[PDB]
Amino acid sequence: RNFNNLTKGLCTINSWHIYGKDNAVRIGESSDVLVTREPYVSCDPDECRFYALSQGTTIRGKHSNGTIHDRSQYRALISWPLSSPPTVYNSRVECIGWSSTSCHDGKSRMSICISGPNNNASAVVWYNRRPVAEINTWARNILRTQESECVCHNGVCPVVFTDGSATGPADTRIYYFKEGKILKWESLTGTAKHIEECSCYGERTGITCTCRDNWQGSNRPVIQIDPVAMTHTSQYICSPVLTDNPRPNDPNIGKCNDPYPGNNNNGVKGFSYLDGANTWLGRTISTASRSGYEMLKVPNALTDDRSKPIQGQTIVLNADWSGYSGSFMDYWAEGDCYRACFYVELIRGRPKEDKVWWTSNSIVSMCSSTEFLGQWNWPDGAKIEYFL
Amino acid sequence: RNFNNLTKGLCTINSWHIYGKDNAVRIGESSDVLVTREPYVSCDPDECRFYALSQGTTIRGKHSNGTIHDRSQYRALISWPLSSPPTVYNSRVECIGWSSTSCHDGKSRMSICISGPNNNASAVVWYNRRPVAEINTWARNILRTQESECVCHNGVCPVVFTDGSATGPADTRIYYFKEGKILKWESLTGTAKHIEECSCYGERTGITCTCRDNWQGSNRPVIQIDPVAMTHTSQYICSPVLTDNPRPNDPNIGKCNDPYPGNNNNGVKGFSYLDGANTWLGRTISTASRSGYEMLKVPNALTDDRSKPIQGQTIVLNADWSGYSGSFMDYWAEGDCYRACFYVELIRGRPKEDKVWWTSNSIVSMCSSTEFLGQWNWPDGAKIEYFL
Amino acid sequence: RNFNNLTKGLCTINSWHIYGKDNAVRIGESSDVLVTREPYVSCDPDECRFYALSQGTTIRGKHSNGTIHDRSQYRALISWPLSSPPTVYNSRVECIGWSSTSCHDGKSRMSICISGPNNNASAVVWYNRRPVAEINTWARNILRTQESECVCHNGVCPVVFTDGSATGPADTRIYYFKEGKILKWESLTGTAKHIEECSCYGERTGITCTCRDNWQGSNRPVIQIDPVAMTHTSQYICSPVLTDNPRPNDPNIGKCNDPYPGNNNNGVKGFSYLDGANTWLGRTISTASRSGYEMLKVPNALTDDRSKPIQGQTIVLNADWSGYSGSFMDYWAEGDCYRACFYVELIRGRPKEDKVWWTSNSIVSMCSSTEFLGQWNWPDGAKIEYFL
Amino acid sequence: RNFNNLTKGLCTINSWHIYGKDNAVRIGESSDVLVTREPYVSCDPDECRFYALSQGTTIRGKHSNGTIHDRSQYRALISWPLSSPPTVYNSRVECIGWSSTSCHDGKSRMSICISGPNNNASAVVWYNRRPVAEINTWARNILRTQESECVCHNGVCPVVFTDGSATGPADTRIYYFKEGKILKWESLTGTAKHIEECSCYGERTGITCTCRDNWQGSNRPVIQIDPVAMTHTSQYICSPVLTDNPRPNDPNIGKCNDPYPGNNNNGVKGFSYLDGANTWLGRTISTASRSGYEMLKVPNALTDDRSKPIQGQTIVLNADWSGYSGSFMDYWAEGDCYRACFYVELIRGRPKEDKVWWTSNSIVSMCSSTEFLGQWNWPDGAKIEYFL
Numbered sequence A, B, C, D: 001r002n003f004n005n006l007t008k009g010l011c012t013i014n015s016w017h018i019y020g021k022d023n024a025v026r027i028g029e030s031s032d033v034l035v036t037r038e039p040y041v042s043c044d045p046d047e048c049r050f051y052a053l054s055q056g057t058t059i060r061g062k063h064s065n066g067t068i069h070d071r072s073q074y075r076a077l078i079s080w081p082l083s084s085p086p087t088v089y090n091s092r093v094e095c096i097g098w099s100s101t102s103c104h105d106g107k108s109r110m111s112i113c114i115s116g117p118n119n120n121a122s123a124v125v126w127y128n129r130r131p132v133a134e135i136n137t138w139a140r141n142i143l144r145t146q147e148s149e150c151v152c153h154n155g156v157c158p159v160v161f162t163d164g165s166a167t168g169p170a171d172t173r174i175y176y177f178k179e180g181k182i183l184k185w186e187s188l189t190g191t192a193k194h195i196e197e198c199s200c201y202g203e204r205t206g207i208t209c210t211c212r213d214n215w216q217g218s219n220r221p222v223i224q225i226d227p228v229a230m231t232h233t234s235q236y237i238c239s240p241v242l243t244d245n246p247r248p249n250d251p252n253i254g255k256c257n258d259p260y261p262g263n264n265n266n267g268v269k270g271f272s273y274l275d276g277a278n279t280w281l282g283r284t285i286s287t288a289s290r291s292g293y294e295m296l297k298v299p300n301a302l303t304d305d306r307s308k309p310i311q312g313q314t315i316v317l318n319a320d321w322s323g324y325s326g327s328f329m330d331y332w333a334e335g336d337c338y339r340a341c342f343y344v345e346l347i348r349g350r351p352k353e354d355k356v357w358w359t360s361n362s363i364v365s366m367c368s369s370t371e372f373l374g375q376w377n378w379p380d381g382a383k384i385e386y387f388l
C-alpha cells in the first residue's frame, strides 16, 4: 500500500547463516529443471523468491547443448519459490531477455530485461507485470545491467546500466525509475573506470552498489547513490583485500581511485557490505578461477587502503565451483535493522566441466547473524558423471 | 467490479518491443508440454495469459502422431501463464472444442468453443467459467470463429462467426454478447466477400477486426463494429501492401471493395492496426508459405489504395517458420492510451517439417513502443533433429 | 456464507452440449497421470472440479499392474481442475478409501471416504477439509456408497449407503448430515429391492437418486428424498426403456415396484433426470457390455410403465468403451433454473483390453441446452497399442 | 489473528481412523517425487500439511544413491499438501538443514532447521517465513531436535533440543520461543537420562512430549512442559508396555525414573497420548527392527508401573516396514475437544532393502474416533523389484 523507505541501518554481522539452497543441478538430473545462469534473490513484502536467466530448455533436454552461450532469443528472467529449483512448472516469467534486474518498491515490482543483437539491444521496463517504458541502446555494444536486485526508496528505484566496450572505456548510466517510468538518468561520474553487473543494497544512508571492473581492475568499483536527490558518486574499494576474479595476490596497499592492475579483460559479478567496522567482503577463494567462496570482515574496507581481515567465514570450499554473487535484503522484515544477505551462483558444466555440453547452476544463499555461528560449506552437490 | 469501456486511442507506434515468448517446442522436447496450434493472448484486469487449442497429447507422447489434423474430439481451449509453455500441469481448460475466442469484459471472462462434426457443429458460450448460451450451426459446414481474443465495451462483446464454404460464399454472422447471453446477431453486410478468423482490437472509435478471405482475396477484409449501436460495416484494406498468405506480389493499386486476385482457396489468420498515420500492418515475409514475419508502417492503409510502407520491423526471419498472428491489448494498463500488441504463432512440424509426425507451435508476442527501438528476430528455436 | 437451498426447477432439456473432457489416458501415455476409476464431477460456489478414486500410481508406472482391483489401501478420493487430467502434481486428496461421495452445502464441502477390509470397513466424514464423524460397518460386507456427488438443502446433505450382499438382500441406509455431523439415519423403505451407487440431483421438489440394482433388476431403482423432513421413498423407473448394464432387450411394459428380470448379479452405476415430460434417461448402447452411451427423452419414465423415447442423443458410439455415469449440477449458476449435467466414465484397459495390465479411465461430461444442438460422439481417444 | 490457546482436553479415543496417506514410494517409481525421511504432519488454522526432510534428489534420480546418510548439505525441511506425495513441483521449502521442527501459533508458523558439520552445527529459527533467531551448538556434537511438530500456547512455543553424545549423557535444552524470538531456555531437569526426537502435543493441562532415550533405555522418556510458567519436568513412561525399538520383551514392572535396560545405543522416534484412562501408546510390533505398528490402550501408562493393555489396534502389519512415528493435532478444528492424531513413517530401501541404493519413505496418518471402528492395515505398498 505504501512505498518502502530505507529507514534502518544494517544489523551487526557476526557470522552468516544458511538462508536458501535449491540443489537445482542434483534435482535436474531427473526432473524438468530449466537451465539457468546469472541467478539472484529478491523479496516482495510477503514473499522472497529466487530469480535467474533461463536458457529456454531443461538440463536433460537436448537443447541444453550450447548453453554456455550468453545471449540467445530463448532466454528470459524467471522467478520461483525460495529454495525450490527453477522448474518448467513452477517458474514465472518476468520478462524476455539476457540481462536483468528486478525489485519491489513496497507497492509493486519493477523488472527490467534487455534483449536484442549486440549492436541493437533494448531494455524493457515492466512494472506490476506490465511493460511501461523502453530504453534503446546508446552505444550499440551489448547494453547490459545488474544481474541482481535493484533497491527502492519512496518509490524511486535506481538501476545501473552499461553500454560499450568490455575491454576499455564504456558508457555507464544510472537510471532512476518510479512505477516503471524514467524520472532521470545520468552518466557515471567519479573515479570508477569501468562498471558492470552492480550488486546493490539500501539502508538509511543511501544505496550502495559493488560492481565489476572488466577492463583493468581487480579491485571492485563502488557506486554510492542518493535516491532522494537522485545523484551518485563512484570510486573503488580501497582495501588491498582484492575481490574480483581472476585477480592478483593481495598487496598491503590497495587503490581507492583507480583499477588495481594484474588481470585485464575479465572479472566476475560480486558484492560487499560497506558499513565501517561492520564491513564484510565476499570473494572467490581461488585467484585464478570461479572456485570457492568466502566472506571476510574487513573494517573500513571502502575507505582504508591498508585494511585487512579480522574475521571470516568459508561458504564454498575451493575444491567446489562457484560463480556470480550478489546482495539482497528483506526490506519488509520485522526489527530495528536490515539483515544483510547474499547468494552465490554455483556454476556446473562448461567451460570448466566439458564432458557435458551444457552450462547451468544452482544457488546457495546466506543472511547475517548477530551470533558467532559455526560454519559449514555448501557445494552444488551434483555428480557430473551422472549426466554422461 | 465495473465493465471496461473503450475510452482511449492507440498509443503512437514507433517500434515494437518483446512482450512474451514461451519457447514451447524447445522445452517440450523434454518436459510434458501439450501439443497446440491456433494460439493467442488475452488479458484480465489483473493478469495476461497465453491461449491456444490443445490437441490433448504432449509432443513427446505417441498421440502427437497425426496432430496436423484440425478438428478432433481431443481439442480444447486452454490458457496458461504469460511466457510459460502450455504444460499438462499449468494449463487451464476454458472449454472443449476446435475453434475459439475469449475476452474479459472488466468483470468476468467470456470464452467460446465450437465442437462437433462438420455438418452438426455448435458453439458453447461460457461466462465466469460457466456455460450460459449455445448456438447451433446455421449452414452445416464447419461453424468457426476468430482464434484470437474478442473485445468488450460496457459489457457488450461482439464476436465474428462463419458457417459455410471455405472456397466460396459463406454465412458470416456478428454476435453481440453480454454476460454470455445473446443480445443480438446480424448477417455480414458491406463489401467483404469472404470472412474467417478475425483479429480484433478496440479503442474509443469502436472495434476493428482484420480477417482472412479464404476464397479469392489476398488483401484482408476488415469489419468495423460499433458495440454501442451493435452495428457493423465491412470492406478490405485498400493498400496494395498485401498481407494474406499465400499472396501475389505487391501492386501499386490495391482493392477496397473486392478481393485482390491471384491466390484462391487459401490464406492465414493475420491482423493490423488501422489508425490513420499510425497504421501498422503485419504479414509473413514469404509470399508463398508461412515463413518470416514483419510489421510495416503504412499510413492510411485502410482507405488509401496507393499506400506504401514508410517504416518497418522484422519480427521473424524468412528463414524461420511463422504461422497465425493476431491482435490483443491490455485494456487495464495505466496511461492515456492503449498499447497495441500482437502475437505470432511459430508452427513446427507438419506439413513443412515432415520428418516428425506431429504439428505444434510456440508463441512470440510484441507490444508497441513510442521509442524507435533496435530490432532482433525471434525464431521458435527448436532443432527438429532432436525429435527424431 | 449461506447454505444453498434448492429453490429452482430443472431447465428444459432439448439437447446436450459438451461441458468437460480430460483426455486423461491419451495424456497419461506420456505424463504423470494417476490411474483412476469411479470418477464424478461436483461444484463449489466458485469452481467446478473433476473427482475420482486414485489407485496410488501413474499409468506408465509399474504399479499400474493390477489396477483392475477395486479396494486397496492405495486408493483415495482426489479432485482436480475441470477438464485437466488427474496428475500427481495437480490432484488434491479429499480423503483415503475406495468408495466415496462429496458435495458442497454452500458454505463448505463434505467428503466421505470408506476404507477397510470387506468385513470391517468404515466411513470417515470430512467437512471443510477436517474429519468430523465416522461410521462403522453395520453388516460387515463391503460398506459402500454413491461414487458421485451428494446434494444439500439448507445445510442438510443426504447420502445413500449400502452394506451387505451384492447378490441378494442388503442393508441400505440413508444418512442425513449437517456440517459433517449425523443428524439422522434411516433404513431403506419402499419397493426398491437392491440399492447401490446412487446418482443424485436436487431441485425444488426434493432430491432424486437413480441407483443400481445389482441383484435381480435391469431397471434402475429410484430413491426420492425430502431433505427437510429427512424422509424418503423408493421404487423403480417404471419405463420399459431399461437402463442398467448388462440388461435384457426393451419390453413394452416395465416394472415400477420390482426388478425387471433377465440379468443377475451385475450392473453399472447410472443416472436419470426424472421430471415429467422433461425426463431424460442415460444408458449404455450395448445391452451386453459397458460400451457406448446415449441419452433418451422418455416422458414420465418414472411413473409410466409403457413410456418410450421421443428424442435422443448419442454421447459415445457403441464401438467405444464407456462405464459409470452420474448426475451433478452447478447449483450456484445464474438464472431461473438448474441446468442438468452428467459425466460418463470411459474405461480403458482391463478386463476388456487385456494387452495392458492396468485399468483406468478418462471423463467426458455434458450439460443440457434449451437449443436443439447437433450431436457429436466423444471417445476416450487413446490408442492401446501405444502402451504396449 | 489471535494466538491459539490450549483450552480443551483430548477427545475420548475408542479407535483410530485413516487420516492421510501419500503412497509416495509407489508414485515415485514413475514421477518426480523427492527422496525424504523423518516426516511429520502439522496444521495451520486453514490447512494441514505433510512435512519431511528432503534429500535434494528424486527417487529415480541417480543422486538417490547414498540417501541412507543422515546429514548432507542437500537436505531441507519441506512441506506439501495433505496426502499428496512430496514432489519437486508441489513441495515448499521451509528452511535448510537435516533436523527440524515446525508449528503454527495461530497467527504465523515457526520452523526451525539445524545444519552444519557434527562439531559446528547451528539452528536457524524462522517465523512467518523469515529468519528471526539463530542458536549455535553448545556441545559441538550434532545439535538436533524433534523431527515432528512443536506446540504453542498464547504465542509461546516450546522446543526440545539435544547436543552431545548419542551413547551417553548429553546436553538437552528446552527453548521457549515467541514470534521466533528466544524468551528463555533451560537445561533438562527430572529423571529422564537421555532425550532425543521428542513428539509433543498440547491440551489444557499443558504440553506433553514423548521422546527417545538412545543410551540405555527401552522405555520412553517423557517431558511435561508448562508453556505459561515456561518450566518442565521429566521422567519415563512407568508402564511395562515398552515402546522403543529395538527393545526387550515386556516385563510386568516398568521403570518411572530410569531407563529400562536390555538394548543400548539405539532407538526410534515414537509417541504416546498420556491421559489417564484415555491413554494410548504407539509402538513397532517387532522388538528387533522397525517393522509393524500398533496402538495400545494402556490406562495410566505414565504413572502406573504395572499397567497393561485393555484394547488395541494394528496400524501396520509386522510383515511391513515402519519407522518413525509422532504426534500432531488440528488445534483449529471445531468442537469441545482436541482429536489425537499421529503419523507413521514407512521406510523403504536401505538398510533393510539393500537391492536398491536409496533410502526413502512414505507416510500414513490416523486420528482418533469416539466410535469403535474396524481396523485395516496400511503398508507403504511399493514393490522394491520395480526399482531394480
Ligand SMILES: *[C@@H]1O[C@H](CO)[C@@H](O[C@@H]2O[C@H](CO)[C@@H](O[C@@H]3O[C@H](CO[C@H]4O[C@H](CO[C@H]5O[C@H](CO)[C@@H](O)[C@H](O)[C@@H]5O)[C@@H](O)[C@H](O[C@H]5O[C@H](CO)[C@@H](O)[C@H](O)[C@@H]5O)[C@@H]4O)[C@@H](O)[C@H](O[C@H]4O[C@H](CO)[C@@H](O)[C@H](O)[C@@H]4O[C@H]4O[C@H](CO)[C@@H](O)[C@H](O)[C@@H]4O[C@H]4O[C@H](CO)[C@@H](O)[C@H](O)[C@@H]4O)[C@@H]3O)[C@H](O)[C@H]2NC(C)=O)[C@H](O)[C@H]1NC(C)=O
Pocket: A240, A241, A248, A249, A250, A285, A286, A287, A294, A295, A296, A308, A309, A310, A311, A312, A313, A372, A373, A374, A375, D119, D120
Ligand atoms: C566452527 O566455526 C567457527 C566459525 O566459523 C570457526 O571459527 C572460524 O575459523 C575461521 C578459520 O580460521 C576464521 O576465519 C579466518 O579469520 C582470519 C582472521 O582472524 C584471525 O586474525 C585476526 C586479526 O589478527 C590481527 O590483529 C590482531 C589483533 O589482536 C593481532 O593480535 C594479530 O596478530 C593480527 O595482527 C585475529 O584477531 C583473530 O584472532 C581471533 O579469532 C581467533 C579465531 O579465529 C581466536 O583464536 C582468537 O582468540 C581471536 O579471538 C584470528 O587470528 C582470517 O585472516 C582468515 O582469512 C584468511 O585465511 C583464509 C584461509 O584460512 C583465506 O582463505 C583468506 O582469504 C585469508 O587469507 C588470505 O588473505 C589474507 C589477507 O590479504 C592474506 O594475508 C593471506 O595470506 C591470504 O592470502 C592468500 O590467499 C588468498 C585467498 O586465496 C589470496 O587471494 C591471496 O592472494 C593469497 O594467496 C579466515 O577468514 C573465523 O574468523 C573463525 N570464526 C570465529 C568466530 O572464531 C571454527 O574454526 C569452527 N570450529 C572447528 C573446530 O572447525
Ligand SMILES: *[C@@H]1O[C@H](CO)[C@@H](O[C@@H]2O[C@H](CO)[C@@H](O[C@@H]3O[C@H](CO[C@H]4O[C@H](CO[C@H]5O[C@H](CO)[C@@H](O)[C@H](O)[C@@H]5O)[C@@H](O)[C@H](O[C@H]5O[C@H](CO)[C@@H](O)[C@H](O)[C@@H]5O)[C@@H]4O)[C@@H](O)[C@H](O[C@H]4O[C@H](CO)[C@@H](O)[C@H](O)[C@@H]4O[C@H]4O[C@H](CO)[C@@H](O)[C@H](O)[C@@H]4O[C@H]4O[C@H](CO)[C@@H](O)[C@H](O)[C@@H]4O)[C@@H]3O)[C@H](O)[C@H]2NC(C)=O)[C@H](O)[C@H]1NC(C)=O
Pocket: A119, A120, B240, B241, B248, B249, B250, B285, B286, B287, B294, B295, B296, B308, B309, B310, B311, B312, B313, B372, B373, B374, B375
Ligand atoms: C537497428 O534497428 C533499427 C530499428 O529496427 C534498424 O532500422 C530499421 O531498418 C529496417 C530495415 O532497413 C527498416 O525497415 C524498412 O523500412 C522501409 C521503409 O523506410 C524506407 O523508405 C521510406 C519511404 O521512402 C519514400 O518516401 C521518402 C520521403 O522522403 C522518399 O524520400 C523515398 O525516396 C521514398 O519515396 C523512407 O522514408 C525511409 O528513410 C528513413 O529511414 C531510413 C532508415 O530506414 C533513414 O536512413 C532515412 O534517413 C529516413 O529517416 C527508408 O528509406 C521499408 O520499405 C522496408 O520494407 C520493405 O523491404 C523489406 C526488406 O528489407 C521487405 O521485407 C518489406 O516487405 C518491404 O519491401 C517489400 O514491399 C514493398 C512495398 O510493396 C515493395 O516495394 C518491395 O519491393 C518489397 O516487395 C517485395 O517483397 C515483399 C515481401 O517478401 C513481397 O510481398 C513483395 O511482393 C515483393 O516481392 C523495411 O521495413 C526500418 O524502418 C528501420 N527503422 C528505423 C527506425 O530506422 C537498423 O537497421 C538496425 N541497425 C543495424 C546496424 O542493424
Ligand SMILES: *[C@@H]1O[C@H](CO)[C@@H](O[C@@H]2O[C@H](CO)[C@@H](O[C@@H]3O[C@H](CO[C@H]4O[C@H](CO[C@H]5O[C@H](CO)[C@@H](O)[C@H](O)[C@@H]5O)[C@@H](O)[C@H](O[C@H]5O[C@H](CO)[C@@H](O)[C@H](O)[C@@H]5O)[C@@H]4O)[C@@H](O)[C@H](O[C@H]4O[C@H](CO)[C@@H](O)[C@H](O)[C@@H]4O[C@H]4O[C@H](CO)[C@@H](O)[C@H](O)[C@@H]4O[C@H]4O[C@H](CO)[C@@H](O)[C@H](O)[C@@H]4O)[C@@H]3O)[C@H](O)[C@H]2NC(C)=O)[C@H](O)[C@H]1NC(C)=O
Pocket: B119, B120, C240, C241, C248, C249, C250, C285, C286, C287, C294, C295, C296, C308, C309, C310, C311, C312, C313, C372, C373, C374, C375
Ligand atoms: C445433427 O444432430 C441432430 C441432433 O442430435 C440429429 O438429430 C437427431 O437424430 C437422432 C438419430 O436419429 C435422434 O435420436 C433418435 O430419436 C428417436 C426418437 O425420435 C423418433 O421417434 C419419435 C417418436 O415417434 C413416435 O411418436 C410419433 C408422434 O408423432 C409417431 O408419429 C411415430 O410414428 C411414433 O409413434 C418421433 O416423434 C421423431 O420424429 C421427430 O424427430 C425426427 C428427427 O429425429 C423428425 O424427422 C420428425 O419430423 C419429428 O420432428 C422420431 O421419428 C429414438 O427412438 C432413437 O433412439 C432409438 O434408436 C437408437 C438407434 O438410433 C437406439 O440406440 C436407441 O436406444 C433407441 O432404439 C432402441 O430403443 C427403443 C426403445 O425401446 C427400441 O424401440 C428400439 O428398437 C431400440 O432398441 C434396441 O436397441 C437398444 C439399444 O442398444 C437395446 O437396448 C434394445 O434392447 C434393442 O436392442 C434416437 O434416440 C434425435 O432425436 C435427433 N434430434 C433431433 C433434435 O432431431 C441429426 O441427425 C444430425 N444430423 C446429421 C445430418 O447427422
Ligand SMILES: *[C@@H]1O[C@H](CO)[C@@H](O[C@@H]2O[C@H](CO)[C@@H](O[C@@H]3O[C@H](CO[C@H]4O[C@H](CO[C@H]5O[C@H](CO)[C@@H](O)[C@H](O)[C@@H]5O)[C@@H](O)[C@H](O[C@H]5O[C@H](CO)[C@@H](O)[C@H](O)[C@@H]5O)[C@@H]4O)[C@@H](O)[C@H](O[C@H]4O[C@H](CO)[C@@H](O)[C@H](O)[C@@H]4O[C@H]4O[C@H](CO)[C@@H](O)[C@H](O)[C@@H]4O[C@H]4O[C@H](CO)[C@@H](O)[C@H](O)[C@@H]4O)[C@@H]3O)[C@H](O)[C@H]2NC(C)=O)[C@H](O)[C@H]1NC(C)=O
Pocket: C119, C120, D240, D241, D248, D249, D250, D285, D286, D287, D294, D295, D296, D308, D309, D310, D311, D312, D313, D372, D373, D374, D375
Ligand atoms: C474388526 O475390527 C475390530 C476393531 O479393530 C477388531 O477388534 C479388535 O481386535 C484386536 C485384536 O484382537 C484387539 O486388539 C487386542 O486387544 C487386546 C486387549 O483386549 C483383550 O484384553 C482385555 C484385558 O483383559 C484383562 O482384563 C479383563 C477384565 O475383564 C480380564 O477379564 C482379562 O482376563 C484380562 O485380565 C480384555 O478386556 C478384552 O476383552 C474385551 O474385548 C474383546 C475383543 O478384543 C471382547 O471379545 C471382550 O468381550 C471384551 O469386550 C480382550 O480380551 C490386546 O492385549 C492385544 O494386544 C496384544 O496382542 C497383540 C497381538 O494380537 C500384540 O501385538 C500386542 O503387542 C499385545 O500383546 C503383547 O503385549 C502384551 C502386553 O505386554 C503381552 O502380554 C503379550 O504377550 C504380547 O507381548 C509380546 O508381543 C509384543 C509385540 O511384539 C512384544 O513387544 C512383547 O515383548 C511380547 O513378545 C490387541 O491389541 C482390539 O482391542 C479389538 N477391538 C475391539 C473394539 O474389539 C476385530 O477383531 C475385527 N474383526 C474381524 C472379524 O477381523
Ligand SMILES: CO[C@@H]([C@@H]1OC(C(=O)O)=C[C@H](NC(=N)N)[C@H]1NC(C)=O)[C@H](O)CO
Pocket: A038, A053, A070, A071, A098, A099, A142, A143, A144, A147, A165, A166, A196, A197, A214, A267, A268
Ligand atoms: C559478455 O560478458 C559479460 C557477461 O559475462 C558473464 C560471465 O559469466 O562472465 C555472463 C553474462 N551473461 C549474461 N548476462 N547473459 C555476460 N553479460 C551479457 C550481457 O552477455 C561481461 O560482463 C563482459 O561485458
Ligand SMILES: CO[C@@H]([C@@H]1OC(C(=O)O)=C[C@H](NC(=N)N)[C@H]1NC(C)=O)[C@H](O)CO
Pocket: C038, C053, C070, C071, C098, C099, C142, C143, C144, C147, C165, C166, C196, C197, C214, C267, C268
Ligand atoms: C464390488 O463391486 C461393486 C462395485 O463394482 C464396480 C464395478 O465396476 O462394477 C467398481 C466398484 N469399485 C470401487 N468403488 N472401488 C465396486 N465398489 C466397491 C466398494 O468395491 C458392485 O457395485 C457390487 O457391490
Ligand SMILES: CO[C@@H]([C@@H]1OC(C(=O)O)=C[C@H](NC(=N)N)[C@H]1NC(C)=O)[C@H](O)CO
Pocket: D038, D053, D070, D071, D098, D099, D142, D143, D144, D147, D165, D166, D196, D197, D214, D267, D268
Ligand atoms: C545420528 O542419529 C540420530 C538420528 O537417527 C535417526 C534414525 O533413523 O535412527 C535418523 C536421524 N536423521 C536426521 N534427522 N537427519 C538422526 N538425527 C540426525 C541429526 O542425524 C539418533 O537419534 C542418534 O542421535
Ligand SMILES: [Ca+2]
Pocket: A212, A213, A214, A215, A216, A217, A218, A244, A245, A263, A264, A265, A266, A267, A268
Ligand atoms: Ca576485473
Ligand SMILES: [Ca+2]
Pocket: B212, B213, B214, B215, B216, B217, B218, B244, B245, B263, B264, B265, B266, B267, B268
Ligand atoms: Ca486468401
Ligand SMILES: [Ca+2]
Pocket: C212, C213, C214, C215, C216, C217, C218, C244, C245, C263, C264, C265, C266, C267, C268
Ligand atoms: Ca442389475
Ligand SMILES: [Ca+2]
Pocket: D212, D213, D214, D215, D216, D217, D218, D244, D245, D263, D264, D265, D266, D267, D268
Ligand atoms: Ca533406546
